[PDB]
Write a protein that binds this ligand. Structure first.
Ligand SMILES: Nc1nc2c(ncn2[C@@H]2O[C@@H](COP(=O)(O)OP(=O)(O)OP(=O)(O)O)[C@@H](O)[C@H]2O)c(=O)[nH]1
Length: 426
RNA sequence: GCCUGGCGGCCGUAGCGCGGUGGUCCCACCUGACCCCAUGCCGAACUCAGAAGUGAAACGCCGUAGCGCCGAUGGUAGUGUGGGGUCUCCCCAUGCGAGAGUAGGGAACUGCCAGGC
RNA sequence: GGGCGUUAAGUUGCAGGGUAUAGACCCGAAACCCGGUGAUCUAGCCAUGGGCAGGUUGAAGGUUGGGUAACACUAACUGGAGGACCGAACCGACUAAUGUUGAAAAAUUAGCGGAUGACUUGUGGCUGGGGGUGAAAGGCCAAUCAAACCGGGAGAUAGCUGGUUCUCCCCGAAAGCUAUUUAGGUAGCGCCUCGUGAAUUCAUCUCCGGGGGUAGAGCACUGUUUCGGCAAGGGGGUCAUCCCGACUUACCAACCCGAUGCAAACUGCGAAUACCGGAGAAUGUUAUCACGGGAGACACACGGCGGGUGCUAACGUCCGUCGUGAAGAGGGAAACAACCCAGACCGCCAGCUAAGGUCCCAAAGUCAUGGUUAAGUGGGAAACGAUGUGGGAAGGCCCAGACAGCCAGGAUGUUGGCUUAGAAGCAGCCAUCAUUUAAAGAAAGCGUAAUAGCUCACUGGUCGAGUCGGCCUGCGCGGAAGA
RNA sequence: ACACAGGUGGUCAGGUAGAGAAUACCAAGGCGCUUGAGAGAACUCGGGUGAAGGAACUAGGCAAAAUGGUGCCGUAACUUC
RNA sequence: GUUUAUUAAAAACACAGCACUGUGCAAACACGAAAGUGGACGUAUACGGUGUGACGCCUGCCCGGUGCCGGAAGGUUAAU
RNA sequence: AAUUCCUUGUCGGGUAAGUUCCGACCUGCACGAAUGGCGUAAUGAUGGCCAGGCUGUCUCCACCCGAGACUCAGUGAAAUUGAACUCGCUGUGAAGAUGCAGUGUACCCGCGGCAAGACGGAAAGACCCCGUGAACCUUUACUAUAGCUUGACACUGAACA
RNA sequence: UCCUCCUAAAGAGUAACGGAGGAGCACGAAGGUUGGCUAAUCCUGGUCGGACAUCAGGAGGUUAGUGCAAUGGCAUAAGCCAGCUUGACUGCGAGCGUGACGGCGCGAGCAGGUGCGAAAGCAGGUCAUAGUGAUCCGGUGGUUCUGAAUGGAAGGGCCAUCGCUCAACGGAUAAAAGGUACUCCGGGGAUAACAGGCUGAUACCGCCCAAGAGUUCAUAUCGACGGCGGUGUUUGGCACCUCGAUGUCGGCUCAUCACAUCCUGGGGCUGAAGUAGGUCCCAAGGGUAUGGCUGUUCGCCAUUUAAAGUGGUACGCGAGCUGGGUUUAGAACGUCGUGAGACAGUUCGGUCCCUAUCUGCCGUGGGCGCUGGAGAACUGAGGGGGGCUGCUCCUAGUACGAGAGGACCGGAGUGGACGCAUCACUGGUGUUCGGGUUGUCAUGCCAAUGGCACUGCCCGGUAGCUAAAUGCGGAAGAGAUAAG
RNA sequence: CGGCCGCAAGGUUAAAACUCAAAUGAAUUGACGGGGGCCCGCACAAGCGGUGGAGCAUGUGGUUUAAUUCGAUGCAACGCG
RNA sequence: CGCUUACCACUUUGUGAUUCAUGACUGGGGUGAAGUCGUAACAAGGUAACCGUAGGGGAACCUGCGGUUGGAUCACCUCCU
């Protein structure tokens, strides 16, 4: 639907503590989501085992009770934390004078509020069009009351089937424009895969995900705030990590547990950076009672886009209060197996984050020095033109050795097709 | 020919303001009242009897434009009729022609009948 | 006081115009009711007679074929029931094809289903129409069936359609208002005609007496704004100093004070016109009003102006007013109801002319003067873009030489430091003192793998005559893709 | 409505092959169906035969193509035996 | 097995079975303005109606409304 | 699910690919016990699906045989029809032009074919709406009435508490 | 139905399913008269007065009030208090206003009796406009009327009064709900569905500016906030047309046009090392899949290809075909309703007619003309057909490149789809050739033949025709050009 | 799970992986009993006087600032060290 | 020798049976330890227990019927067979 819910709207929240559907939902998570939406909740109903109802997703008497509660509260709309089937919302809508909305609609609504860009607006519109396509079946019958079953001649098919085809034609046109936005990113991606720069995408929960991590690393202005979500479109800036060289970091939007399946598809269409990320990072926050519950959900979103496989260093947030680990630049092993604990909110650790980046960077334990061309002065001018080696030292017999080791590069250019007729060194 | 009281005309060039001025001519206060009347208590109001006292206030007169108020000519908006271009809008001939400003005017004038030179 | 009256001409024929009641101009329903005719088609039932080639399976009756304490267990085979099977006659009708003005108002050809049964068939009979009969379909009851056929009431009724037949002359509408079991019908009124009366009646214009609240303006009022001024009260920086102060704060002040807009439901103003009344010429076949006879119309259309609604869309809708079409031809706008000119009594192988035009189609200027455009503009299109072209008033510079191009000089400190033998702008800064001002930048863009180089402030530039921009304006240009 | 491809109750029932009143061919008997002559286009109808592939056709194996008899063996799930 | 003769042959209808109800015979019920007749020359192991549909397993809870059946303490109640 | 809107629900199968099918899950918009619930051998011109075989259904048609169609002789209709000297395009127009305007093109007549158009023929559209139209059906619409039922009076008498 | 404002264009009047609000009463005082009186707002000093009371003073005719909506009014007050009261009287009413009428409204004054005031005088309801209901039919009271032979009386009339959410408010009647997919009649494109027409809000496409996004870097690539256009092209609006008839999706067959171009050609920019792309310009000559599911356009998928364009053509095409779809009558399920029945639910089943006059095409003739009549061979004004491409190899592993990879030049072969011809080959067919064979009948019979059974069934097959067979081709050039 | 039986409900035959240092039996000594018995104590009863709402003093639940120093916390801390 | 017939390996077709992995969903293990609900059993465990079998709890468990002991206990001052 082109229309989206207005912020500041009065509303009621109906959440069964056990609302079925695997019960991975959290009421504390719901309050953060509703605050961003602009829902004004006078009363939050908490219930025990209301039978999932084919009619209302809540007990038939409870549906009358929530209708009575809504009439008294003055709340303009009804919000339900677990999913309502298209009939299920429609039956609830008949019982109360006020209209109703659902969590799939509410997360879709949240995306609209946090979107300030054209790519985000088209992406949100497509996702709503998919969710509303299922929702519109009840609405189409109400529209056809005026039609009175006319349209038998012209379209051979029964009336209202043609109306679905027109919405589907709008869906087909919508898909073509969305493809163009991705195609433009892919032309940029073709230049981006120069093979000299790795692609990095930062993923996480809406609050746990550290898009703030880019701010400590690049000191670049970005919108990081308490409001749920709020970074819908990705930001890519140049960061030269000393250990890995030039790298590009992309801020993928944060996601929540039980993410609407259409919304993961829409998020991926904008975020193909997640699909192509050579290095990926997941951030976990202690604000939720169980850090583990957020971890499994992030994996499911990654599984949806098939990026779950990449081995990932895990960053941590809320560490500032905990102060459990002070960042330490010590390698117990060359692999250095650990999960980074530094949090970007206070800038706790930077060289230690880089040590984890050295673990990410491919390295040789032997680090055998590459053969070096004879003219150091010409090499130094080339280093000034490109990258000067961080450590360079003289070696015995007039040899020069540098910390960067590239034996394959020296074989490919310095010693490949040379005749060596003189054969001074055999 | 002056100053006062009434009853009108005209109702801001008429009003308000500021400063002055006048007293048994008048007028206003003022003096008394379990008297005629009179307060939903109220001789601040209304009456009645009248002398002292004063123009303080009021009242009237004079100056003062500080504001009110009136306000040209010219220009403009509009519009009647014919004609034209015809973005919803105009333009031309022609007749009528604002409001708002502006220079300015502006502190009234006049009748009738009684009390005082 | 009023209201209705006051001896005011009628009556009967004949002819015509209306209205009422009858079939009431004419044709045309679906239906309803009444009395009959059909069960030779069909549906059920009754009575009495027929048919079912062939082939197969085989029940019961089992005369009976073992054994257990006894039960369980369990032992041979003649017959000929079946709403049995396969399949002709027979009955039906599942798919396809042809036919569909056929051979046929449901058939033909290939395949199909039942065919000893709740079968089929012949001959009679019975049940009759709001009735029958129904293994149930609103099936069937003579190619007719949510109620047969025939005659009657019957020319039912039909605010609905269609048609309405000879000639000429005169006038000539309306598609509005109010009502409606009413919206496509009707009644009254307005508009048309015919007659009879009547006064400078009516119109146009001039002059005069009005009243308003429209346009337009304006913001005092009702609201709606913007800015500047700003402590009343509270935010409150001091504040468990409210401190009868540390201040009223380093915030809005609230009315308020100056300016600025906006209004259909705002008005301290206020037109043009329109309306009403009066007088007066001139004119118009009393054009006006009243009464009586006869209507039609009460579906309007477009354009102009003033608006509502829509999207300042619609050949949209709904109003007010005018014009045209309707109901008006002719000339023009290529063709064209409503747009422009003009209102056709007739004839002429006569002139003038409106709108519109004068190169050919195609009547008339290859007319005159001056100017503009170079696109075929003319001959579809906006925001915007541009040394297209033409005009106008200004500004700077210039014979201490206009504007170009052009080459050289344009350098220490100021390579001094700071991501480091790049330390200097390319990550940033300290910087403007000048030495040696014809001239010299601790520079605008750069570049070199730092360290060279580039253009320009000044000079000499011969050539030199005008030169650089802006504004306003006429006509062009690009923006500019359809089957 | 017709000199109409439909409908119309019973009876008789030869030969050969065949279970048979199926069917093929014949008896006895009756007929060639009241417009013909050419030519041998498309197209239409009713058929015949098809290389290779074989349901790819199509809404759907619609239609067509196949199998088909008698004798002897042999025969599953389930079962109301 | 029957059926929409003449666009529907079906999952429709029927069916044997099962229950519920009425019905004592001059039966109930029907066609009859009535006589009569069918039911039936039958007699509750019979008839009529309604529903379901062989078979196997079964048919839970509820009489609040409406109907039907039984009862009236009182009230209301026509003609007269 | 002859029932589930969403829905092509989710899984597993069968295919290269399966909205059908089959089997599970229960989240029954809107199953449920003679308005019958669940199964069921046999049966079905029943509904849906999957195989083997087979083929002109198909790729993609080809040839052949007969009946027409063609020509010749004889007999000899039909629907329809305001009149026609009956092109195309673009525009206009009661808004889809053989007939108007402009332009291109076009000697005059058949015969055999194809159907793009003559808003082609057939049939006062069947869809929609109106008529202070009609029929039939239903009920808790109004007004009645058959039918059932209740009392009184008559037909209809006597005697004893 | 009534009242008030606006639209309503300064007389009045004026419509819409146009924008805003009220009434279906109240008071015997809130009426009449006489007399008196004058507000809302803040400030100052003061009680449990402080923003809220009540004082003493300071602003105005009034920002107050009006029984209640709105507008017009209002100081002489209509506003507020007191006293006395009942004119909230009866009969009439010159004259107006407003309506088509029925009616509604104002009305000085006359007459008879009241009230208040000394008097002038004023009063026939409320400051005004809403607060209502005709007629019929009945009820009650009075009456100076009539009363069916007469005297009465019932009954009627007149006068006063009563009974209507007759609210659909100019009111059919005392009294009235639904269904029809079983439907039928008379009309209407006066009125919706399909298509065409207007429009273009939406849609789609393009441009204007450019905060941004881009590894630094608005325009390589997209572009927020806003703006302007184009098209008829999607959703809509309208109702001009079509209801005495314009067949509805899809598929099959057959097409044609536009260029907003999918492939193939030519370019520009690139954040284009090569390969491969992105974006834009020019360019319409040709080309632009097969299947599974399902009725599908769609969609999802599997696998092709150089690509499997986007639209118009009545969302092309039913006198061309289909009928899965919808769109009838049978049945069932879920839900709604007491029910008949219903469903923008599902499911199974369910009649698609035309002999071509005209234009139009596709083929093929006749007549006359072209100037004496013939028989030939041609020029070419015009017109049509044809215009596709892949794969491999050389150049060359060269250019390009750190590698991985790997050339828009220039040559050669080889195919796919398409069109044309042909029948030498390979095949098909071949009822008009030969043979085998089942059943029967005939020619006397054996033998040999023939008829009939689909050509009886087959097996083969010549000519001819034909594809699945083989040949051939879409070119190279040349001229004028588009972007460049 | 398979077999067999059963109309079902279920019966019978009857494992495995996985897990633990136990699981159990009878006795002993205590503790405890909303088990029984006998007793005792202002424990109850029979009485007398108080506490539970006004100034001293103590702690905590606890607040506050510079601290409101530390401890004592049912009975057996709370006029306590 | 060629040829033919029997036997037969590879192989192929149909139809079954038994093993292993796996098959959304679903049924049922001991368990780090605190924020985590009731009290069924052990005392007569506050309704004696558990044994079979049905139905209900939808927390252990409750209740019906039969069984078993692997069950605790013998009374308030208080006129009279
Ligand atoms: N974890 C954590 N975050 C903190 C802390 N303090 C402040 N923050 C902020 O909380 C974070 C909020 O979540 P974000 O990291 O913004 O989530 P995000 O995914 O970047 O946000 P979106 O992309 O807008 O959804 C950042 O804004 C941090 O700066 C802290 O102590 N811990």
């Amino acid at each position: 639907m082109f229309d989206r819910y207005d912020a500041g709207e009065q509303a009621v929240l109906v959440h069964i503590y056990f609302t079925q559907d695997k019960d991975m939902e959290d009421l504390q998570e719901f309050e953060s989501l509703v605050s961003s939406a602009g829902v004004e909740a006078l009363q939050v109903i908490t219930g025990s085992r209301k039978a999932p109802h084919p009619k209302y997703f809540v007990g038939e008497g409870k549906a009358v009770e929530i209708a009575e509660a809504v009439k008294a509260t003055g709340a303009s709309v009804v919000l339900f934390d677990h999913a309502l089937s298209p009939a299920q919302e429609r039956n609830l809508e008949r019982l109360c004078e006020c209209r109703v909305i659902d969590r799939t609609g509410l997360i879709l609504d949240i995306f609209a509020q946090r979107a300030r860009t054209h790519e985000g607006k088209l992406q949100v519109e497509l996702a709503q069009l998919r969710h509303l396509a299922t929702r519109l079946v009840r609405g189409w019958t109400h529209l056809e009351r005026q039609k009175g079953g006319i349209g038998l001649r012209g379209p051979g098919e029964t009336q209202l089937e043609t109306d679905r085809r027109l919405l589907r034609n709008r869906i087909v046109q919508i898909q073509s424009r969305l493809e163009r936005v991705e195609k433009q990113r892919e032309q940029g991606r073709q230049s981006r895969i120069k093979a000299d720069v790795p692609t990095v995408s930062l993923v996480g929960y809406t609050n746990a995900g550290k898009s703030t991590l880019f701010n400590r690393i690049t000191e670049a202005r970005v919108y990081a705030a308490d409001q749920l979500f709020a970074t819908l479109d990705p930001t890519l800036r140049r960061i030269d990590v000393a250990d890995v060289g030039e790298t590009v970091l992309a801020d993928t939007v944060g996601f929540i547990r039980h993410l609407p399946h259409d919304l993961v598809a829409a998020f991926k269409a904008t975020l193909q950076e997640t699909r192509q990320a050579t290095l990926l990072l997941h951030v976990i926050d202690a604000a939720d009672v169980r850090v583990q519950e957020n971890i499994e959900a992030v994996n499911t979103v990654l599984e949806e886009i098939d990026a779950h496989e990449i081995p990932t260093l895990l960053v941590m947030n809320k560490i500032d209060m905990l102060e459990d680990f002070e960042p330490r630049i010590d390698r117990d092993e060359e692999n250095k197996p650990n999960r980074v604990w530094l949090s970007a909110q206070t800038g706790a650790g930077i060289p230690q984050l880089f040590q984890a980046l050295t673990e990410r960077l491919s390295g040789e334990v032997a680090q055998h020095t590459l053969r070096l061309p004879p003219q150091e002065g010409r090499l130094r001018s080339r280093f000034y033109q490109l990258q000067a080696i961080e450590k360079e030292w003289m070696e015995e017999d007039g040899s020069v050795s540098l910390q960067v080791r590239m034996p394959i590069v020296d074989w490919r250019r310095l010693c490949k097709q040379e005749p060596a007729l003189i054969d001074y060194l055999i």
